[PDB]
């Protein structure tokens, strides 16, 4: 019996079977509900739209994200997300397939309680397990030691592991990722004359952020270059046919990852978070940590981020260390791909939470069994 890997991220649900490069269902985690007066009768009008169907008809819908910063708020919407990704995207019964689920660290435990109760009572499985995303990222990296910076759409977390031993006191969580960058890009696109206020326009701002933005190596030199000459300005076409051109906003938007005070937040950037997570570890393993930095998630897909992060850590680390950052082209789905590693492992078959253990222990064995 093949297992299931379902990364339920804040932005994109990535679901599929065991042992694939791409997740079989990659779609944004949105539930659409109509906000206008339906005047035509019949023609297959639906009260809700999930996935790319909501993306297609987004002009006449209000889109809701059931997951915000790794914590699921609306649960009936999350049940609709799971029912759509089981019965329609993958078209398989949940009663005959074990399902590995991912989780951000330092998540509230009631979220684990409710996903265990819903997964064992609404979409009742033979077994399910709740795992950490950074461990799967280190699996997909193909190594054992190293520090992982995961950055999805709600959660950016740093986890250091040495020889298979994670350090739970050194795990750091930062609620700053691509949704906050999309909101900041909405805030700074208003400067050039372009207004985007609705939830349907969030997809357009996210598409602009995905296509045109990049990470600058030196911030102030790129400010001087953008202010002096318009060589950095690039164009984009909206679906209504309008043409926009952006300059410095190509590299002001991801800079909030390296400078969180742009959106008004006290905590430090991702390179200071990486460095402080390194120095919280014991002193002997740090040389192994500096040469094995791992980035995963879609937020580190800008084509300037590895050289900038190397420059910042080499500024922070002492000069006798080789700062090597692993930045594969496959790192957008590597959180899923290491889930293909762990679910296919022969040593993982005894660690699943079965139906019977849930039946004596209630929905509380998931704390003592998982991380």
């Amino acid at each position: 019996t093949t297992a299931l890997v379902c990364d339920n991220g804040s932005g994109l649900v990535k679901a599929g079977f065991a042992g694939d490069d791409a997740p079989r269902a990659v779609f944004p985690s949105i539930v659409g509900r109509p906000r206008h007066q339906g005047v035509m009768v019949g023609m297959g009008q639906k009260d809700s739209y999930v996935g790319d169907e909501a993306q297609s008809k987004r002009g006449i819908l209000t889109l809701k994200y059931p997951i915000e910063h790794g914590i699921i708020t609306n649960w009936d919407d999350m049940e609709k997300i799971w029912h759509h990704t089981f019965y329609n995207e993958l078209r398989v019964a949940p009663e005959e397939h074990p399902t590995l689920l991912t989780e951000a660290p330092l998540n509230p435990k009631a979220n684990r309680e409710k996903m265990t109760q819903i997964m064992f009572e609404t979409f009742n499985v033979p077994a399910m397990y709740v795992a950490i995303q950074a461990v799967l990222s280190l699996y997909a990296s193909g190594r054992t030691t190293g520090i992982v910076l995961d950055s999805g759409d709600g959660v950016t977390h740093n986890v250091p592991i040495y020889e298979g031993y994670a350090l739970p006191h050194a795990i750091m969580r930062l609620d700053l990722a691509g949704r906050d960058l999309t909101d900041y890009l909405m805030k700074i696109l208003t400067e050039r004359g372009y207004s985007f206020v609705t939830t349907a326009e969030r997809e357009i701002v996210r598409d602009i952020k995905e296509k045109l933005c990049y990470v600058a190596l030196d911030f102030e030199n790129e400010m001087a270059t953008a202010a002096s000459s318009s060589s950095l300005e690039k164009s984009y076409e909206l679906p209504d046919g309008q043409v926009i051109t952006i300059g410095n906003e190509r590299f002001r938007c991801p800079e909030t990852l390296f400078q969180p005070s742009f959106i008004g937040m006290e905590s430090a950037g991702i390179h200071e978070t990486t460095y402080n997570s390194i120095m919280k570890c014991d002193i002997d393993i740090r040389k192994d940590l500096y040469a094995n930095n791992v980035m995963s998630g879609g937020t580190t897909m800008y084509p300037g981020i590895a050289d900038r992060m190397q420059k910042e850590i080499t500024a922070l680390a002492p000069s006798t260390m080789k700062i090597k950052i692993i930045a594969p082209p496959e790192r957008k789905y590597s959180v899923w791909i290491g889930g293909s590693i762990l679910a296919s492992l022969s040593t993982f078959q005894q660690m699943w939470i079965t139906k019977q253990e849930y039946d004596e222990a209630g929905p509380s064995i998931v704390h003592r069994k998982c991380f």
């Binding site: 065991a18 042992g19 694939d20 490069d21 791409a22 079989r24 293909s340 590693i341 296919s344 022969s346």
Partner: peptide, 23 residues
């Protein structure tokens, strides 16, 4: 030890890597 001395003198990885190419 004496009966032991008497009785003597007498893959996950390639399986997943094949199927990642299917997408």
């Amino acid at each position: 030890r004496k009966q032991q001395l008497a009785e003597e003198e007498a893959c996950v990885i390639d399986a997943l890597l094949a199927d990642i190419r299917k997408g």
